[PDB]
Amino acid sequence: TSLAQQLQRLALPQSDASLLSRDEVASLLFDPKEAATIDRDTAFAIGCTGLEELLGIDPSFEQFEAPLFSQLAKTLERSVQTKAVNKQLDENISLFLIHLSPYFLLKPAQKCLEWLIHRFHIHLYNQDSLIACVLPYHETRIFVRVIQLLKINNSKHRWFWLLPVKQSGVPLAKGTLITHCYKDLGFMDFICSLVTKSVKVFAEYPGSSAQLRVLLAFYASTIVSALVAAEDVSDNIIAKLFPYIQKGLKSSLPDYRAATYMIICQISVKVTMENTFVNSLASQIIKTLTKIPSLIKDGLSCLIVLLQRQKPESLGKKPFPHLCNVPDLITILHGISETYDVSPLLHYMLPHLVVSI
Amino acid sequence: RFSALKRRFYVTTCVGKSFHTYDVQKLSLVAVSNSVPQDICCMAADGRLVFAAYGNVFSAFARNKEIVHTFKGHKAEIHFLQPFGDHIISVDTDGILIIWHIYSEEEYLQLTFDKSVFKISAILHPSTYLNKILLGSEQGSLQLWNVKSNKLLYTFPGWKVGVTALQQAPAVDVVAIGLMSGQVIIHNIKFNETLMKFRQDWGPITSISFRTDGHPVMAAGSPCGHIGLWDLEDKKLINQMRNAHSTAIAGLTFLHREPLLVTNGADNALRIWIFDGPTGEGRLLRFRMGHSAPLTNIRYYGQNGQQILSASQDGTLQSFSTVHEKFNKSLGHGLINKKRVKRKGL
Amino acid sequence: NELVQLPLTENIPAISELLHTPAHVLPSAAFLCSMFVNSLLLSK
Amino acid sequence: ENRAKLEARLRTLEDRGIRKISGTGKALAKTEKYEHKSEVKTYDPSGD
Amino acid sequence: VDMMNNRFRKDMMKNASESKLSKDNLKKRLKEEFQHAMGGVPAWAEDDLLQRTGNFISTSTSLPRGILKMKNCQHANAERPTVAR
């Protein structure tokens, strides 16, 4: 089996057996027996029909007509071309899957995904991109089909923990997702990197905030729950989370800032923090408050939480001027005061206010 | 050290009055050198030979076992050895720098530096530079010299802390400078700009290595025994390896085009680290280790006499073979409730 | 002197019900942030 | 009121059955053997 | 400089004409060998808690819940042992 282990480690998607025979064909829409009786023209027609339907709902797909849904893509087969061509194809497929992710529950997206699987074998070459595209819909059955397309049998594979949902045909449970998220840091880094990349891609198009809704909600749903599930939050988790927290604070998307606020609130509730890190977090919250005028109040309330569950003298005097210069500060503070306690913020403010006067 | 006629890398560690050579593939001993009268203070390797310094005299070793050339003419202890083609550069304690031809053993050039003004604490020969060496000082200044012309090309004002380490970055004109304060400075010596700065609060920079397997990662050691991993691309801290060695880190090097790190220390341990886990978590791959604490009791075991049982202050019992080190074995630590140790580790 | 127990995420029923729903059914993140941060505050 | 409580209980039962088949998820990917790359090129500064 | 008759430089020759290369030809030859060995040119070559090393988790003044840190001590009545309740 030493020769067998060497051979199975030497295996590559380029030298797959299914490339050289038509006994079995992988298909998202059809069983393999019927899928082995489909000509390339029929699959191309289904993909073009799906893309044409998708163009009506969202225009910005037109750029994918030429590289992926044309005659040149029809004739092209990846194994024949060099690594640079495959890398460019990987970039194009990743961009198209990022665009597809909001519409995955719709049928035209399924047709386009079927054409991509038939022509480019993305289940072998682009496993990570496909998983990133389909992950926020893990409670659905089409997710189970997409997982069943992949081969994850090896216990040393990255996606081995997704094996039972392939074997039993059941959706992934959220508790397992949370446990693997907090215990395995690579999965959390994958989720954060996917969120940042999708936000950066969708930033260019004006009026595209809605397209990022569900994914961002998923980003809000798991991480906080992961912080709930962990018995003790080690310094590794916070060290990994902090750059993404800063990126969320620096962004202009309301939902991304809201998810960052929830993550910050949960972290402040659960773990005790050194004075320096509380100071830096409060400085970053105060300095970037006024960028989004619709998220002022929550941000201020978030600061209150950070100033209520930590040591009283954690915060310094440096962010005090920028805190005072926000428009209508006392009116928002009074509006919050009508329902909730605002004592920590005034407790911080008054000794600095008298000295500054 | 890389080898000719054998596409393999060898690591050489100083052991008292001798040195040992191991293949990096499996950490198997391949040679043991002859003894020298004094303890070895500095070592260097140039592929063909191994250079060792003891007292005020240094010699060259061939076949990793025997001396073929010895060099006399220094009145103080040597701390630095720089192989330069067919020539060798030696730096004394008082401040004498002499270039010697290895085979003929004659002195090519003699240079002196004022101890108060410029005491050499680090030496580096940048790659693709014709007859050029870089000199660092405890005062904090850097001098670029040309051996052939025997003139000072340029003087870098540097920083007031003082230089402890010099390392060639994977670039034509970029070097890494370590400071006593714990600060690593990435500098371009041709046009005099600093690309980026990193700081660790663990003491002076012991050694710096660069990962060249396609990932821009830099590692710097500390006297506390900790190693910091920095991302050159994003200018941030990736992760920190705490207590890699109990004692101070002596030397750390990434294998060329490999995700492997080779570290040794004063705790009588040579270890290999592989960065293949998720999120770049280094893990122990291979190690060759002996007692890390002074011995308490040693007794011969067996009438055949090929093994000796030894006990140390680290709480371990070990057996050392007298014929070959492949038969060395360890009996472990003294532990009640061994089944709990399985669950949580040592 | 007086000891006050601050609200916790697992104890709040509304937050748990909001966290137990599937992601695609889940509403926008701004509403979730509003409810979460308001529930984390101490009510007077 | 009683109908809403039963439906809330029924949703929990479906999720728990899914959780049983899917697994805890505490397990991670297992480690793999490593072999060194051979015939690797290197630069010798002695030529300088 | 003599590319041939030098052990280190003879491995760097390409054709028979370059027995002796000039200074400028040697520089680009040395540079490209370095870049081939390094695998190319790295991209990086042409307030915040992760620009320094430090901690993130600290101890609280209040007693933590869930787990109590305790150590057993010597028995109070060790000097006077008894069997009664």
Curated annotation (Swiss-Prot), chain A:
> Which positions are tagged coiled coil?
none
As for subcellular location, the record says:
Nucleus, Nucleolus
N-acetylthreonine PTM sites in chain numbering: T1
Highest rank taxon of the organism = Eukaryota
Q: What else is known?
A: The protein described in this entry is essential for the tumorigenic capacity of precancerous glioblastoma stem cells and their proliferation during tumorigenesis. The protein is overexpressed in patient derived glioblastoma tissue compared to control brains. Overexpression is more pronounced in high grade glioblastomas compared to low grade samples, and expression levels inversely correlate with patient survivability.
**What family is this protein classified in?**
Belongs to the HEATR1/UTP10 family.
Query: Subunit comment for this entry?
Result: Part of the small subunit (SSU) processome, composed of more than 70 proteins and the RNA chaperone small nucleolar RNA (snoRNA) U3. Interacts with MYC; the interaction is required for localization of MYC to the nucleolus.
What does the function comment of this entry state? Ribosome biogenesis factor; required for recruitment of Myc to nucleoli. Involved in nucleolar processing of pre-18S ribosomal RNA. Required for optimal pre-ribosomal RNA transcription by RNA polymerase I. Part of the small subunit (SSU) processome, first precursor of the small eukaryotic ribosomal subunit.
Name the record gives this protein: HEAT repeat-containing protein 1
Biological source species: Homo sapiens (Human)
Gene name, Swiss-Prot/TrEMBL: HEATR1
Q: Which residues of the full protein are shown?
A: 2 to 358 of 2144
From Swiss-Prot, chain B:
Q: Does the keyword Endoplasmic reticulum apply?
A: no
Q: What is its main location?
A: nucleus
Q: Where in the cell is it found?
A: Nucleus, Nucleolus
Keywords tagged on the record: Disease variant, Glaucoma, Nucleus, Phosphoprotein, Repeat, Ribosome biogenesis, rRNA processing, Sensory transduction, Vision, WD repeat
**GO BP, sorted A to Z:** ribosomal small subunit biogenesis; rRNA processing; visual perception
* Tissues and organs where the protein is expressed, per its UniProt entry: Expressed in heart, placenta, liver, skeletal muscle, kidney and pancreas. In ocular tissues, strong expression in iris, sclera, ciliary muscle, ciliary body, retina and optic nerve.
Report the GO terms under cellular component: nucleoplasm; Pwp2p-containing subcomplex of 90S preribosome; small-subunit processome
What Gene Ontology molecular-function terms does this entry list?
RNA binding
The residues bearing each WD repeat, given as ranges, are: 1-32, 41-70, 79-112, 121-155, 162-199, 206-241, 246-289, 296-330
Q: How does it assemble?
A: Part of the small subunit (SSU) processome, composed of more than 70 proteins and the RNA chaperone small nucleolar RNA (snoRNA) U3.
Q: What else is known?
A: Depletion of WDR36 mRNA in cultured cells causes apoptotic cell death and consistently associates with a reduced 21S rRNA and delay of 18S rRNA maturation.
Q: What does the entry's free-text domain comment contain? A: The WD repeats are grouped into two tandem seven-bladed beta-propeller regions.
Name of the protein described by the UniProt record: WD repeat-containing protein 36
Species assigned in the record: Homo sapiens
Q: What is the lineage of its organism?
A: Eukaryota, Metazoa, Chordata, Craniata, Vertebrata
Per the record, the gene is: WDR36
What part of the full protein is here?
32 to 377 of 895
From Swiss-Prot, chain D:
Q: What does this protein do?
A: Required for the biogenesis of box C/D snoRNAs such as U3, U8 and U14 snoRNAs. Part of the small subunit (SSU) processome, first precursor of the small eukaryotic ribosomal subunit. During the assembly of the SSU processome in the nucleolus, many ribosome biogenesis factors, an RNA chaperone and ribosomal proteins associate with the nascent pre-rRNA and work in concert to generate RNA folding, modifications, rearrangements and cleavage as well as targeted degradation of pre-ribosomal RNA by the RNA exosome.
UniProt family annotation:
Belongs to the NOP5/NOP56 family.
Q: Which residues of the full protein are shown?
A: 386 to 433 of 529
Report which superkingdom the organism of origin falls in: Eukaryota
Q: Where is this cross-link: Glycyl lysine isopeptide (Lys-Gly) (interchain with G-Cter in SUMO2)?
A: K26, K30, K37, K41
Q: Where is the composition biased (Basic and acidic residues)?
A: 29-42
Question: Which lineage?
Answer: Eukaryota, Metazoa, Chordata, Craniata, Vertebrata
- In Swiss-Prot or TrEMBL terms, this protein is called Nucleolar protein 58
Q: How is it modified after translation?
A: Sumoylation is essential for high-affinity binding to snoRNAs.
Where does the record say this protein resides? Answer: Nucleus, Nucleolus; Nucleus, Nucleoplasm
> Which organism encodes this protein?
Homo sapiens
Q: In which tissues does this protein get expressed?
A: Ubiquitous.
UniProtKB/Swiss-Prot annotation, chain E:
Q: Where is this cross-link: Glycyl lysine isopeptide (Lys-Gly) (interchain with G-Cter in SUMO2)?
A: K31
Q: Which residues carry this modification: Phosphothreonine?
A: T53
**Organism's domain of life?**
Eukaryota
- State the compartments where it is located: Nucleus, Nucleolus
What this chain does, per the record? Part of the small subunit (SSU) processome, first precursor of the small eukaryotic ribosomal subunit. During the assembly of the SSU processome in the nucleolus, many ribosome biogenesis factors, an RNA chaperone and ribosomal proteins associate with the nascent pre-rRNA and work in concert to generate RNA folding, modifications, rearrangements and cleavage as well as targeted degradation of pre-ribosomal RNA by the RNA exosome. Involved in nucleolar processing of pre-18S ribosomal RNA.
- State the family named in the UniProt similarity comment for this chain: Belongs to the WD repeat UTP18 family.
Complexes and interactors: Part of the small subunit (SSU) processome, composed of more than 70 proteins and the RNA chaperone small nucleolar RNA (snoRNA) U3.
Protein name, entry field: U3 small nucleolar RNA-associated protein 18 homolog
Q: What is the lineage of its organism?
A: Eukaryota, Metazoa, Chordata, Craniata, Vertebrata
Gene label? UTP18
Q: Which residues of the intact protein are shown?
A: 153 to 253 of 556
